[PDB]
Amino acid sequence: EPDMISVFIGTWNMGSVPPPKNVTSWFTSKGLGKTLDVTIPHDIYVFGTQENSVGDREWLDLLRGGLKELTDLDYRPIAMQSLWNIKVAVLVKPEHENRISHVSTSSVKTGNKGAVGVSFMFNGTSFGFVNCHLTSGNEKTARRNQNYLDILRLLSLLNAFDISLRFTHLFWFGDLNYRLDMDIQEILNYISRKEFEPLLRVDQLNLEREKHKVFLRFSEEEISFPPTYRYERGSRDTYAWHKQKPTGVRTNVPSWCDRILWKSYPETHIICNSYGCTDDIVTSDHSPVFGTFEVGVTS
Ligand SMILES: [Cl-]
């Protein structure tokens, strides 16, 4: 009977290391951006991650018990898919168990990079969740754009007919790994002034969307939080933008690598309540990103 449902899409690049004891902020959209700083539990939790070194059943344990400590409800996993260290998981309120149908998972390798995806039906309405890791490196904007198109065609979630038209609501999140077309100096000035707008005019992802090359007719909430990459581990005061190392020196300008985009159909409405990132979770050089939405469901 529920006309509306709240969905949580969380994306985090764990950075080849396990998570910490506490990850409440992430779950509850606490931190910076369009944030939620009662704590009422979401109808569905959907977790995407990119360099998650925790085992697949181990990892899903943490999610289940992290939600139990928070909500006091046994969220039950509907589906889960892994592709090396790229992993996604879809959990749901016990009561909503017998509304999920036609659940499907799939993966696509574009080494080590690609997409992991789940789709399913909630009553009448259909959903799609793609989680991905794309080609890294400031100048590799063409290869990412390829990655998208390959994931858009090759992902198996009516399948041998269309692509990003299959689902009522398609969310697409993860480490899209798109950078800023700017020199470190300005980037850092604009970050210290908390003036992200001039940097977003120049963000690669936005530039390719604006050139109608990738993510056609996709929507994204307006970013008002600092670039999620690349931090120094152990705090969030310091971008790790030019460390020297025996494995080479790497010149990474801070970027909004981590993103949540969606595409719905008309007359089927969906508002976005939260879209931000943490500031307390400091085990990875990425900061985890969250996004919460209210979504229309029918019989
Ligand atoms: Cl890499």
Side-chain angles (χ1 to χ4, degrees), residues 240-278:
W241 66 265
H242 177 273
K243 297 216 265 227
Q244 225 194 35
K245 251 189 284 196
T247 50
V249 53
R250 327 202 65 138
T251 187
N252 309 64
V253 296
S255 298
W256 282 286
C257 288
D258 314 284
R259 312 289 225 108
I260 302 183
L261 299 80
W262 76 96
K263 181 184 169 189
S264 302
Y265 278 129
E267 197 55 285
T268 62
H269 279 144
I270 159 176
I271 294 283
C272 175
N273 281 23
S274 71
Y275 182 51
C277 65
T278 82

Side-chain angles (χ1 to χ4, degrees), residues 91-111 113-152 154:
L91 298 84
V92 146
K93 270 186 177 174
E95 58 170 296
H96 296 334
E97 178 186 312
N98 301 359
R99 300 200 149 99
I100 313 314
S101 58
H102 297 258
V103 179
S104 157
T105 53
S106 195
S107 73
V108 169
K109 33 169 90 198
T110 53
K113 284 160 190 171
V116 168
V118 327
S119 73
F120 60 95
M121 269 179 177
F122 193 95
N123 287 330
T125 303
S126 68
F127 291 79
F129 303 89
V130 163
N131 168 232
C132 61
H133 200 161
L134 309 186
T135 314
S136 54
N138 258 115
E139 305 297 69
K140 295 277 145 280
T141 321
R143 295 201 204 288
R144 289 175 215 116
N145 283 2
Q146 265 295 302
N147 294 160
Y148 174 84
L149 289 155
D150 286 331
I151 295 167
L152 198 65
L154 306 190

Side-chain angles (χ1 to χ4, degrees), residues 20 23 51 74 100 138 148 168 183 207 271-272 275 285 289:
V23 293
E51 282 179 54
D74 289 324
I100 313 314
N138 258 115
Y148 174 84
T168 308
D183 67 305
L207 296 181
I271 294 283
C272 175
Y275 182 51
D285 47 8
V289 155

Side-chain angles (χ1 to χ4, degrees), residues 56 58-74:
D56 284 357
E58 268 196 317
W59 177 64
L60 183 65
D61 266 25
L62 291 172
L63 294 180
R64 204 194 289 118
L67 297 172
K68 182 61 175 178
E69 267 284 332
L70 192 62
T71 71
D72 211 58
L73 273 56
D74 289 324

Side-chain angles (χ1 to χ4, degrees), residues 189-249:
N189 297 6
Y190 284 139
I191 301 297
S192 106
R193 289 160 152 282
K194 298 175 182 184
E195 286 187 17
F196 306 125
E197 165 53 10
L199 294 181
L200 286 171
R201 308 218 137 169
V202 134
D203 152 72
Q204 281 165 352
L205 188 42
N206 284 330
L207 296 181
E208 301 308 317
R209 273 174 65 220
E210 285 161 357
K211 297 167 178 190
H212 293 50
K213 276 183 165 297
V214 304
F215 284 85
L216 281 158
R217 290 191 140 270
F218 268 72
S219 309
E220 186 176 25
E221 190 56 288
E222 276 175 305
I223 301 171
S224 64
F225 55 100
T228 58
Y229 179 77
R230 178 201 193 182
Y231 289 105
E232 204 143 24
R233 287 183 172 78
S235 86
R236 303 285 90 158
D237 300 18
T238 287
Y239 288 105
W241 66 265
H242 177 273
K243 297 216 265 227
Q244 225 194 35
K245 251 189 284 196
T247 50
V249 53

Side-chain angles (χ1 to χ4, degrees), residues 131-152 154-189:
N131 168 232
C132 61
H133 200 161
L134 309 186
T135 314
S136 54
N138 258 115
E139 305 297 69
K140 295 277 145 280
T141 321
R143 295 201 204 288
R144 289 175 215 116
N145 283 2
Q146 265 295 302
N147 294 160
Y148 174 84
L149 289 155
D150 286 331
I151 295 167
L152 198 65
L154 306 190
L155 199 63
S156 72
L157 284 170
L158 59 71
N159 65 339
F161 288 82
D162 26 49
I163 49 194
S164 75
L165 284 91
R166 305 191 184 173
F167 311 111
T168 308
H169 304 270
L170 183 72
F171 300 80
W172 196 308
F173 46 97
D175 186 348
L176 306 198
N177 223 253
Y178 279 103
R179 311 302 230 265
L180 301 183
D181 279 7
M182 192 164 268
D183 67 305
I184 189 73
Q185 299 256 347
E186 304 302 308
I187 296 194
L188 285 177
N189 297 6

